Amino acid sequence: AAASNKDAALLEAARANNMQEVSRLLSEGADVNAKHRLGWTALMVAAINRNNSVVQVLLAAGADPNLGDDFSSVYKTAKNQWTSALEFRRWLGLPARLNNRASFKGCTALHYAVLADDYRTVKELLDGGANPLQRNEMGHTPLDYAREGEVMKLLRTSEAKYQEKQRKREAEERRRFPLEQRLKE
């Protein structure tokens, strides 16, 4: 049970913003990707907490930035279809009746950091390999949740660089590409 207990204690420490306990538990082999019964990982709850310090520690310990929230309850937001990103923000109480269903399933730490408009945590997650194009169950990217401002500007830049990196990784080997070939499929 020791291993299961370290996982559960790691999640409690992250939810409580206890950076010292998070670090201890990670060094003792707690599963950095463990999920709470409420659905979230330590990385996600650190993002909800706007704790960019704990986020950095988790990433340095190998946390997978692109795991999705397991919480699968669905809510009706009014008196179907997934609510829009703008109405999802409103439903969360943040600044700014057909599609009235809401779900957290699949939200990444980056979704939460952007919802919180937390530039420092957003930058940490992107620098640690978070995929800004990955969608949650409702089909929303983190950029869909951004307020205008520095987080939005950062995400636009990061989307372009992530797509560039992906295109370079998938690149096909070709020894020659004469200009005439641009005219042919």
Residue numbers in the entry: 129 to 207, 228 to 244, 257 to 345
List sentences from the manuscript:
Owing to a lack in our molecular understanding of the Ank domain, we solved the crystal structure of ANKiso1 at 1.81-Å resolution using the single wavelength anomalous diffraction (SAD) technique. Although the crystal structure contains only one ANKiso1 molecule in the crystallographic asymmetric unit, it appears to form a dimer in solution. Amongst the Ank motifs, Ank2 is most unusual and features a long β-hairpin-helix motif instead of the canonical loop. The electron density for helix α5 (residues 232-240) is clearly visible in our experimentally phased map, which is sandwiched between the β-hairpin and the concave surface of the Ank domain. The interaction is mediated by hydrophobic contacts between the side chains of Phe236, Arg237 and Trp239 of α5 and His300 as well as Tyr305 from η1. In the crystal, this sandwich conformation is stabilized by the C-terminal segment of a symmetry-related neighboring Ank domain, which wraps around the β-hairpin, and may provide a structural basis for dimer formation in solution. Although the overall structure of ANKiso1 resembles the AlphaFold2 model (AF-Q9H078-F1), we note that the long β-hairpin with the intervening α5 helix is unexpected and markedly differs in both the location and secondary structure from the predicted AlphaFold2 model. The structure of ANKiso1 suggested that binding of helix α5 may compete with substrate interaction. The crystal structures of the Ank domain showed that all three MGCA7-associated missense mutations map to the Ank2 motif and cluster around Cys267 that follows the long β-hairpin. Interestingly, the Cα distance between Cys267 and Tyr272 is 7.0-Å, which is within the range of Cα distances between disulfide bonded cysteines observed in protein structures.
SKD3, also known as CLPB, is a ring-forming, ATP-fueled protein disaggregase essential for preserving mitochondrial integrity and structure. Ankyrin repeats are one of the most abundant motifs found in eukaryotic proteins and the Ank domain is the defining feature that distinguishes mammalian SKD3 from microbial Hsp100 unfoldases. Here, we present the atomic structures of the isolated Ank domains of SKD3 isoform-1 (ANKiso1) and SKD3 isoform-2 (ANKiso2). The two isoforms differ by a 30 amino acid stretch present in isoform-1 (exon-5), which represses the protein disaggregating activity of SKD3.
